[PDB]
Design an enzyme around this catalytic site. Sequence first.
Site, PDB file in Angstrom:
ATOM      1  CG  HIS A 124      65.921  33.615  88.418  1.00 19.97           C
ATOM      2  ND1 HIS A 124      65.188  32.583  87.870  1.00 19.97           N
ATOM      3  CD2 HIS A 124      65.099  34.691  88.439  1.00 19.97           C
ATOM      4  CE1 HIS A 124      63.975  33.017  87.578  1.00 19.97           C
ATOM      5  NE2 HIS A 124      63.895  34.293  87.915  1.00 19.97           N
TER       6      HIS A 124
ATOM      7  CD  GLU B  65      60.394  39.993  88.935  1.00 24.26           C
ATOM      8  OE1 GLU B  65      60.121  38.793  88.735  1.00 24.26           O
ATOM      9  OE2 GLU B  65      60.812  40.766  88.048  1.00 24.26           O
TER      10      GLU B  65
ATOM     11  CB  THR C 161      62.418  38.156  82.174  1.00 24.85           C
ATOM     12  OG1 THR C 161      62.406  36.731  82.024  1.00 24.85           O
ATOM     13  CG2 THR C 161      62.879  38.529  83.570  1.00 24.85           C
TER      14      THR C 161
HETATM   15 ZN   LIG Z   1      62.300  35.550  88.124  1.00 22.77          ZN
END
Ligand SMILES: [Zn+2]
EC number: 4.2.1.1
Length: 257
Positions: free
Chosen positions: A91, A103, A196
């Site tokens: 993803h 990120e 996450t």
């Molecule tokens: Zn990720």
Amino acid sequence: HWGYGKHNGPEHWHKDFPIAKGERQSPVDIDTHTAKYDPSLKPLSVSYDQATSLRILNNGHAFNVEFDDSQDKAVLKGGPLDGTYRLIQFHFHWGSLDGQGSEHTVDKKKYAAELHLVHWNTKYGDFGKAVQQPDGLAVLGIFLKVGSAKPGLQKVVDVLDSIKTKGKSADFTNFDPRGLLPESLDYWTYPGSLTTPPLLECVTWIVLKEPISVSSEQVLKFRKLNFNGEGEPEELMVDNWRPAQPLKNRQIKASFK
Ligand SMILES: [Zn+2]
């Protein structure tokens, strides 16, 4: 529940997931000058020739391209890894503008997006058991910058219109992830976590130094996706990234000198 908004974003996650303030959280800023070459690292082996994709899903946070991991086909080995890690899905995380989206950061630089190829340690039998182990997962991270189009990514882009909202999925077979890899496998590695919730600390992160280039039109289509479900007010799926977390007691190792 959790999300990326002002009232349910990254700074709120610790309330339901206390590990958010843990000792090995991800992502992190990669200070290239502080990272040290590690001679003990073995050659990284990415074997995706037998990869079998099955479907693509909008999970309300991003979209996952899932693979059949019932057999040892697409695997990641070598590098800092001991044993074989099997590819389960990939993803991305991206921003609302080209200047943000990744990120991990490199010397504080944010890329437009970041690709995550998720693998689990086969010694643990399955993904569920693997996420109960300190070395249960290996995520290969690849940065995306905006420039020339990435041919191997177009098939993913063209199917996004069919999974616009949360909960929607579509058949997605015969997709070859090898088309998303940059030329060089030079990388940085460190022990971290899922970025996450539940933010489990079972990940060996392997972040490639060379970013792949994707076109403005390709990322723009990522930004047309929705966080919301069908029939609900539109909330564009953008800026679904967690910012850099404290490095704490960790050292980032480089595969190159
Ligand atoms: Zn990720």
